[PDB]
Design an enzyme around this catalytic site. Structure first.
Site: not given
Length: 187
Positions: A53, A124, A120, A61, A111, A58, A100
Site C-alpha cells: 500500500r 496507530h 493518525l 505500508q 507503515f 501519506f 491495525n
C-alpha cells in the site's frame, strides 16, 4: 506476568530492493511494539515481503507475509495492545507506526509516513522513525501505484532485515541464564 524489559533504543536496517532504510525504534517508550518488530525481524518474518500500500504524500505500508493487505501475525500469535505516548506523534517525515483493525489489534503490518499526519495520533502506535536512507524512502514514494488499489506498480520489497542493535539482549540473557541454572541444579 513475566516480561522482557528493553534497555535503550533498537536499530533495524531494512534491506529493500530500492536500497537500505535504517530505523530507530523507541523501545523504552513502546516496549511491546518494539519487541514484536525486533523478534519478527530476527526470525526472518519479513524476508521477501512487499510494501502493498503506497499513497503519495501519506504513507507506505508493508509487513504482510501474505501480500494481501490483511494478513500477518504478531510474534506471540494474538493481536496486541496499542502503546500511545504523549511525546510521540506523527510529525515530520519517516515516522514508523503499526497498522491495525481497531483498538489493541496490532499484528505484523507497519507503515512509514511521508509527512506529518496528526489524524493518525492515538490511532496507530508510533514505535520508531527512519534515521537513514532518506533517499531510499523518496525513491519508494516515487514509485507509481495503481490508483484503484494503492498497490505499487513495480514491486517494493524487503529482502532482509538486520537488527543491528537489539535492546532485549540483557533481558533475554538473564532469562536464558536463570533457566539454564534451574535445569542444571534444580530440575
Amino acid at each position: 506476568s513475566s516480561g522482557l524489559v528493553p534497555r535503550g533504543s533498537g536499530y533495524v536496517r531494512l534491506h529493500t530492493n530500492k536500497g537500505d532504510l535504517n530505523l530507530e525504534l523507541h523501545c523504552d517508550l513502546t516496549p511491546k511494539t518494539c519487541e514484536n518488530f525486533i523478534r519478527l525481524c530476527k526470525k526472518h518474518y519479513y524476508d521477501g515481503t512487499i510494501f502493498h500500500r503506497s499513497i503519495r504524500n501519506f504513507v507506505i505500508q508493508g509487513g504482510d507475509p501474505t501480500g494481501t493487505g490483511t494478513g500477518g501475525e504478531s510474534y506471540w500469535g494474538k493481536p496486541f495492545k496499542d502503546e500511545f505516548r504523549p511525546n510521540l506523534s506523527h510529525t515530520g517525515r519517516g515516522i514508523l507506526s503499526m497498522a491495525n483493525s481497531g483498538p489493541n489489534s496490532n499484528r505484523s503490518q507497519f507503515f512509514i509516513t511521508f509527512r506529518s499526519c496528526a489524524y493518525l495520533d492515538k490511532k496507530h502506535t508510533i514505535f520508531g522513525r527512519v534515521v537513514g536512507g532518506f533517499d531510499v524512502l523518496t525513491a519508494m514514494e516515487n514509485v507509481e501505484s495503481d490508483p484503484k488499489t494503492d498497490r505499487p506498480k513495480e514491486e517494493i520489497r524487503i529482502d532482509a532485515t538486520t537488527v543491528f542493535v537489539d535492546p532485549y539482549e540483557e533481558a533475554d540473557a538473564q532469562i536464558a541464564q536463570e533457566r539454564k541454572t534451574q535445569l542444571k541444579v534444580a530440575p
